Design a protein around this ligand. Structure first.
Ligand SMILES: Cc1[nH]nc2c1[C@](c1cc(-c3cccc(CC(=O)O)c3)cc(C(F)(F)F)c1)(C(C)C)C(C#N)=C(N)O2
Ligand SMILES: Cc1[nH]nc2c1[C@](c1cc(-c3cccc(CC(=O)O)c3)cc(C(F)(F)F)c1)(C(C)C)C(C#N)=C(N)O2
Ligand SMILES: Cc1ncc(COP(=O)(O)O)c(CNCC(=O)O)c1O
Ligand SMILES: Cc1ncc(COP(=O)(O)O)c(CNCC(=O)O)c1O
Ligand SMILES: [Cl-]
Lengths: 442, 442
């Protein structure tokens, strides 16, 4: 007593928009550091009938009948996750049920410190995530500044983590958790140094490696698993999985952490797991452990380096003057434009990026930079030689933005009046489209 | 630089388990009150490339480029949602970003009362959800008992909500929110009466209609939208959508509630929306508003009434002695067996149900009932006449359970040694498979 005609038939209205979306993705230079493109197999898992099953709890201990094959999927995903990050199931545990990065983080922090517990994270404007305790004088923007007592460490004026500031703050504030691993941080992290500050104050070491996970799995960047108590990561960014998350926990350093984290995910926060996600994660984690995926990840850093190098060669300034990873933050102060303007300009030419703060940004109403990254385009086969074009396209967009602002003014509503039908923008779009639309698309 | 082989080729291990899961779903009598089967259209949305897009924020106010077609999908889903529940966009608003029911509830409660705020919900044992403030003597089991101050009202010894007890509790405790609408409650709710109790003590009325949503839309059961300040619902149960949730809020009764709820969902709790979910939710919400779907939902209640009636005709006791909705709770005290034993027995014959408390239960270690429901089997085409067969199968399972406990003992670990290779169970399983396997399966 259901309707089984295809999407296109049942809902032509929705099917048009999705078809539109697919054309825009195919025809965009996607430079969002946190985006990627999933393969057909990951998307086959996400559409699988396994999302019909309620399976609250954990393997073998399910509050519903008929969970025998769901248990195998969930245990396979845990296995592959410990394999991907080169950890022993004797020493490390992983919860695979968290619905996304933000949920995973609030859950993991709750497990460690409880309500009113103290945490330390990097400030938003310095590259930290919302879920690392972010707040404003005006309000407690994240739940992690409200359900917990949070304190925020800033980076220095060059953009680097200042460990002397982290230690000083940890000694006076005495948090139970210090969060490192970030959202728009272009350098690697001295986890050992964090571990040393946490041992000093008897605080847990939380590493959120969502943005850099693939590097950690492939041994290209530092490994927080040598030093960290908890490691969270989303699966949808550089790792190239579905939208989901993983909480890793060190049983050897913290006996009984396993039950606290598992009880935090369920029944404290979540109800039913999303088994289509877990399937999809299982599938991508198998790809992650092959040497082919390591080649992809290597290519991501090779593209990021080149893209950084080409922008500097066109007199564009970068936070920390470079990158150790997949992402760059461009400082736009020398052109007297905002990242909010460059994002609209770039949207008009099919270039996807985001506005981003820089260390000198006092207020998020006008961020002075944009963040870009290479995972997505590296998935489409762009090589090092291809990065000069992207750098040229971004250079041209900055210049057009400067022209548009001169003509129409620094007010954002006014600036947008300048964009539609602009002949250079139409010309740049056409160039962007022709190159992007040519690339392999999963 | 990706692998585009199909799922079967890239990951044969995982593909087999999923083919196994599909076979088990096809050949199971699924009586889980919270489960259903999605059509191929909803599953096409869930596997769509729209899940590649980061779109943190709300339509038009997005922190990333390239969100033009995502904004249309997200505004289409909100529109279709308000249409489905027969509310005007001038008086009612809806957030469509919550990842699941538990998230929706914690977010909505936070919006209304904040950390340390006071809430009242129905106790777990009496049919309430975990997210309605559930705790026990030993621990704050749900975050809704810890981040909030919760108190729990019980149903009477017959299983019905005791409004007198809710009034008494509200006057002494003075909560800021009262939650009604439940997980294992077999009757309809007098929301007006709740609205009257909330106006007395200036509390918000929260209706969680996850289990009865299709009835509320189709106008078969009482409508909490006439009375409630907030309505939450999952989209994966009787409504038959993907795994997601909706928060509805009453703008007329509560000017400014829109911002509170939207900011609670993001950036307080969540990060990026899962756009494949929102597409999927959009698709099914269109079906929900059709006359075909009302027919389905009427059939759910016609099946549930008949199933109640046939079980009573075989001397099986039901909590409240019947049902006004899609679900029944069988009291197993007269047979001296537990619901945990009947769940295993039923799992051995491909009958999916869950163990469930009844009002006399003092421990969730030994629940005295099972909950069953008709949405799933109703989706497979089962009519009123077919409920006698389901009732026959359940009666036989209870009888076999009694026999096995007699032979092997009351101990749960001992009882399971009875189940494998049991000739009658093999006979019953075979009978279950034959009827289930033949039905229409989306
Ligand atoms: C949207 C989002 N989520 N997590 C983030 C962001 C980022 C972000 C968040 C915000 C943000 C989001 C919600 C609330 C607030 C507070 C406020 O509006 O004052 C800021 C703002 C910006 C920008 F550039 F507009 F200033 C950026 C970006 C990755 C998009 C961010 C930065 N910078 C960091 N560090 O992390
Ligand atoms: C799994 C789950 N989520 N929300 C529920 C449940 C239900 C449930 C939760 C629980 C439950 C879940 C987690 C933690 C606890 C506390 C404890 O184990 O002591 C109980 C137990 C049962 C049962 F029957 F085993 F006793 C049932 C069922 C729908 C499965 C439930 C009941 N009864 C109610 N009212 O609501
Ligand atoms: C370090 C980090 N942790 C957690 C999250 C949360 O992920 P969800 O969106 O799945 O909640 C993000 C999101 N990253 C935002 C961005 O870089 O675009 C992140 O960058
Ligand atoms: C009334 C109610 N509200 C919210 C939720 C939470 O939904 P998620 O599982 O999607 O978090 C449930 C789950 N229902 C459990 C059951 O009846 O089987 C529920 O029954
Ligand atoms: Cl999903």
């Amino acid at each position: 007593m259901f309707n089984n005609e295809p999407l296109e038939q049942i809902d032509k209205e929705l099917h048009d928009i999705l078809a539109d979306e697919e054309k825009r993705q195919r025809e965009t230079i996607n430079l969002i550091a946190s985006e990627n493109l999933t393969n057909g197999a990951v998307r086959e898992c996400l559409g699988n009938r396994v999302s019909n099953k309620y399976s609250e709890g954990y393997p073998k201990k399910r509050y519903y009948g008929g969970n025998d094959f769901i248990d195998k999927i969930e245990e396979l995903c845990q296995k592959r996750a410990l394999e991907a990050f080169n950890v022993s199931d004797e020493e490390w545990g992983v919860n695979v049920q968290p619905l996304s990065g933000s949920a995973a983080n609030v859950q993991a922090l709750y497990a460690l410190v409880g309500v009113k517990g103290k945490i330390m994270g990097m400030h938003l404007c310095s590259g930290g995530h919302l879920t690392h305790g972010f707040f404003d004088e005006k309000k407690k923007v994240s739940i992690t500044s409200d359900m917990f007592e949070s304190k925020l460490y800033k980076c220095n004026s060059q953009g680097y983590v200042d460990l002397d500031a982290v230690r000083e703050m940890a000694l006076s504030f005495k948090p139970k958790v210090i969060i490192c691993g970030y959202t728009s941080y272009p350098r690697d992290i001295d986890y050992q140094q964090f571990r040393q500050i946490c041992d000093e104050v008897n605080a847990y070491l939380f590493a959120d490696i969502s943005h850099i996970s693939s590097f950690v799995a492939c041994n290209i960047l530092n490994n927080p698993f040598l030093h960290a108590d908890v490691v969270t990561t989303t699966t949808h960014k550089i790792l190239r999985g579905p939208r989901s998350a993983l909480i890793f926990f060190n049983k050897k350093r913290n006996p009984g952490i396993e039950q606290k984290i598992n009880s935090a995910v369920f029944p404290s926060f979540q109800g039913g797991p999303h088994n289509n996600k877990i399937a999809a994660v299982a599938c991508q984690l198998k790809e992650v452990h092959s040497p082919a995926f390591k080649e992809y990840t290597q290519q991501v850093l090779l593209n990021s380096k080149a893209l950084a190098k080409a922008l500097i060669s066109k007199q564009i300034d970068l936070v920390t003057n470079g990158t150790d990873n997949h992402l760059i933050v461009v400082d736009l102060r020398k052109f007297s434009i905002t990242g909010s303007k460059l994002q609209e300009t770039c949207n008009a030419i099919n270039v996807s990026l985001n506005k981003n703060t820089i260390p000198s940004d006092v207020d998020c109403v006008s961020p002075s930079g944009v963040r870009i990254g290479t995972p997505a385009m590296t998935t489409r086969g762009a090589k090092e030689k291809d990065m000069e074009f992207i750098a040229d396209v971004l250079a041209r967009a900055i210049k057009i933005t400067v022209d548009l602002q001169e003509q129409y003014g620094k007010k954002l509503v006014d600036f947008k009046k300048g964009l539609p039908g602009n002949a250079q923008l139409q010309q740049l779009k056409q160039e962007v489209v022709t190159w992007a639309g040519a690339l392999p698309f999963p």
